[PDB]
Amino acid sequence: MVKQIESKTAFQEALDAAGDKLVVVDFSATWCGPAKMIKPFFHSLSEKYSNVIFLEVDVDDAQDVASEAEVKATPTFQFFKKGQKVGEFSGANKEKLEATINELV
Amino acid sequence: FRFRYVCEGPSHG
């Protein structure tokens, strides 16, 4: 299902509890429209891909996660698996989430 | 305040 990260502590725990399924992270700003404007897609895949783990991060209130990931543009899609990174891509591209997930699925 | 860098969502085009 989906899982919100409020601090770096929940970040690592998210990957550990994410099991071995894919893990896509949405680095969108809650106060920014253009970023949150794409949540109806990323979060929607939650019901279309119940076999995938989706996370959420606040690049403004969780600068700790964005700092470690050095995010400089939102939304930033980052893919993790077993606590390891396998791919990543930013830019409003909700349709790409489909091809990317089916790729490293 | 909660501000950081630019949001290149559907803002580019």
Side-chain angles (χ1 to χ4, degrees), chain A residues 28-76:
Chain A
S28 298
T30 179
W31 68 269
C32 210
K36 159 164 160 46
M37 170 51 154
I38 322 189
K39 80 158 39 164
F41 279 80
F42 177 80
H43 154 98
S44 155
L45 305 184
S46 303
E47 317 191 85
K48 197 189 192 304
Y49 280 107
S50 61
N51 191 98
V52 176
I53 318 311
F54 298 106
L55 279 54
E56 189 163 301
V57 170
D58 201 77
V59 288
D60 295 279
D61 165 67
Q63 298 172 329
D64 40 290
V65 191
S67 285
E68 191 73 58
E70 298 191 82
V71 187
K72 295 180 175 50
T74 58
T76 322

Side-chain angles (χ1 to χ4, degrees), chain B:
Chain B
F1 64 81
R2 302 146 156 301
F3 284 73
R4 258 280 188 166
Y5 37 97
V6 201
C7 319
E8 41 165 58
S11 193
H12 183 246

